């Protein structure tokens, strides 16, 4: 029994590759960021960043939903703009920014990932922090 | 872009698994940390890592009692497995990672022929 489609607590990247999906698909891996593949962008009025992540089965280039970043930085793009008018507000941002960098350094958890098979690269939608309920999900899956 | 890493994905492995049996994924409590190196403890046993010399860090200080994941290149399995750190991640935030980790490995190994 290896249809790891929705089998909790998370699934694997190689399972998804091996399945070869016809259209856009949603999974949870428990992954970590290997590197950042690009600069942090604020273009289009929102945050974006390309990292390469992994779950032990494959590597994956991901983009990041503006929602995640705003929370990690505590600042939206427009709040960033106004954090200039006031310099003390900028300071507070500059922190949120290396705070963001710290976060991504130490980031490892379940990632709701949206894989596009055609244009080949995925896009991280949520980050679930791994809890004890997930722990028991893996006990049952390993037939205990 | 400004990056370079091994062709095949980091494998979830335990100290023992290496010690008994090239780019890997291991975790463990920090037993000793000094300069560019540190010795870790997972439920299987102990393993050394070098080259922290050159990995990114969230906190400037790697202290004993922390729990961390290492993506490393294997060095010399005998007589206790050494690693060459490529990247390292701090998991001390979450007490679960420790509990979970032993299983995380089995589950991967069931799922890859």
């Amino acid at each position: 029994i290896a249809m790891d489609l929705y089998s909790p607590p998370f699934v694997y990247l190689s399972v998804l590759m091996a399945s070869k999906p016809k259209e856009v698909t949603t999974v949870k891996v428990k992954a970590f960021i290997v590197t950042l593949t690009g600069n942090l962008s604020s273009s289009g009025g929102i945050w974006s960043i390309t990292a390469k992540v992994s779950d032990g089965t494959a590597y994956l280039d991901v983009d990041f939903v503006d929602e995640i970043l705003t929370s990690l930085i505590g600042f939206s793009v427009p709040e960033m703009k106004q954090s200039k008018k006031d310099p003390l507000q900028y300071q507070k941002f500059l922190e949120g920014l290396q705070k963001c960098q710290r976060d991504l350094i130490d980031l490892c958890c379940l990632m709701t990932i949206s894989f596009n098979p055609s244009l080949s690269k995925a896009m991280v939608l949520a980050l679930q922090d791994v809890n004890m309920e997930h722990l028991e999900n893996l006990k049952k899956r390993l037939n205990k | 872009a400004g990056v370079r890493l091994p062709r095949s994905p980091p494998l979830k492995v335990l100290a023992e698994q290496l010690r008994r049996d090239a780019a890997v994924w291991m975790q463990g409590r920090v037993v000793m940390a000094d300069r560019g190196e540190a010795r870790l403890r997972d439920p299987s046993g102990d393993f050394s890592v070098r080259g922290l010399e050159r990995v990114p860090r969230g906190r400037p200080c790697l202290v004993p009692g922390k729990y961390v994941m290492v993506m490393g290149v294997v060095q010399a399995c005998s007589p206790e497995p050494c690693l060459q750190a490529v990247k390292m991640t701090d998991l001390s935030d979450n007490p679960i990672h420790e509990s979970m980790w032993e299983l995380e490995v089995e589950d991967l190994h069931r799922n890859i022929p």
């Binding site: 960021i33 290997v34 590197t35 950042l36 593949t37 690009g38 600069n39 942090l40 962008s41 604020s42 920014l97 290396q98 963001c100 960098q101 991504l104 350094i105 | 872009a1 400004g2 990056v3 370079r4 890493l5 091994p6 990995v55 990114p56 290149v73 060459q84 490529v86 990247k87």
Partner: peptide, 12 residues
């Protein structure tokens, strides 16, 4: 002017 909170890595 520059952003890119960039953590990033090589080996060898």
């Amino acid at each position: 002017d520059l952003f890119s909170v960039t953590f990033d890595l090589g080996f060898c």
